[PDB]
Amino acid sequence: STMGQVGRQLAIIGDDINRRYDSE
Amino acid sequence: DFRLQTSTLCHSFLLASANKQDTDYLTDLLDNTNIDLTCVPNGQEIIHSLLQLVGDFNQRFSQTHEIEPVAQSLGIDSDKPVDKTALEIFYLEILNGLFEKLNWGRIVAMFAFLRILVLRLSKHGHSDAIQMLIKTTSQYSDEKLKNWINLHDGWSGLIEFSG
Numbered sequence: 801s802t803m804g805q806v807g808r809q810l811a812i813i814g815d816d817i818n819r820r821y822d823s824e
Numbered sequence: 825d826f827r828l829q830t831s832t833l834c835h836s837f838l839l840a841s842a843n844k845q846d847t848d849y850l851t852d853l854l855d856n857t858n859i860d861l862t863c864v865p866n867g868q869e870i871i872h873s874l875l876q877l878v879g880d881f882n883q884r885f886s887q888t889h890e891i892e893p894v895a896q897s898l899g900i901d902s903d904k905p906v907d908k909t910a911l912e913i914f915y916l917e918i919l920n921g922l923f924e925k926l927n928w929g930r931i932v933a934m935f936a937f938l939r940i941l942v943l944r945l946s947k948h949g950h951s952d953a954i955q956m957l958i959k960t961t962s963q964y965s966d967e968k969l970k971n972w973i974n975l976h977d978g979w980s981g982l983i984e985f986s987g
Contacts, residue, residue, distance in 0.1 A: 803914040806894060807921020810933045812885050814922070817877060818929025821985055 825862070826974075827966035832861045833979060834958050837874050837935055838942055846946055853951050866980045868887040873986040874935055896946050906945070906953040912960055915941075919964050926972040928985040934961065 838850055864870065895901040898914055918937075922930055938961055945954050965973075973979060 801917055801921075802920070803917035804921035804961045805938075807918040808924070809889065810937055811924065811930055812879055813888075814927070814933035816884065816929070816931035817880050817932055818927045820880075821877075821928065821987070 826970045828860060828862050829864050829979065830965045831958065831962040832864050833867070833870065833874075834935070834938065834961055835861065836864075836867065836871050836895070838939060838958075840871055841875060841878065841939055841944065846943055849946055849949070850954075851944075853954065857928075857955060864979065866983060868917055869983045870979055873982040874932070877932045877982070877986055878936040878939065881932055885936070891940065891944070895941075898941075900944055900950070900953070901947075903948050906950050908953065908956055912955060912956060912972065915957060916984050919961075923968060926969065928976075928981060931969065931973075931982075 827851060833929060835854055839847060839854075842850055892901070899906055900911070919934065922933060922937075941957055942954050945957070973981065977984070
């Protein structure tokens with residue numbers, strides 16, 4: 801939906817943060 | 825209790841990430857709101873992590889997105905009394921969208937965004953919408969994140985997540 805879309809834009813930034821902070 | 829713990833984190837985190845003017849407006853709103861707070865274990869460590877990590881978030885989001893659209897689409901930049909329950913709906917849809925998967929980074933994004941909404945709501949003193957967002961974040965957390973979170977050392981996961 802319209803607002804659902806927003807959540808996934810937010811989600812990509814989230815996943816970028818998540819990747820960077822992985823102990824890798 | 826997890827819902828009460830998570831609520832307290834939102835309040836603190838918002839009080840520690842606002843400018844002087846907004847800090848005061850929010851601090852008094854909370855005082856008058858006369859609501860319950862517990863003590864969060866590692867609370868200070870957790871809030872520090874969140875400031876660092878919401879910092880990571882902000883710095884990226886000013887690169888690849890703007891605000892003005894969504895506030896309007898939410899009806900939050902108005903001097904006009906905001907639609908309590910319409911806003912819950914959209915908020916809820918945005919969280920549901922944000923949370924199709926779970927991990928720390930996406931949780932961070934929920935605090936950074938809630939901050940952004942709260943700070944824009946407070947330009948016109950939309951106190952009840954503000955308290956509404958914070959309460960909804962708390963319920964949603966207790967309904968959908970808590971199991972994931974408790975599998976990762978609880979809210980303190982953030983401390984290590986962040987280094």
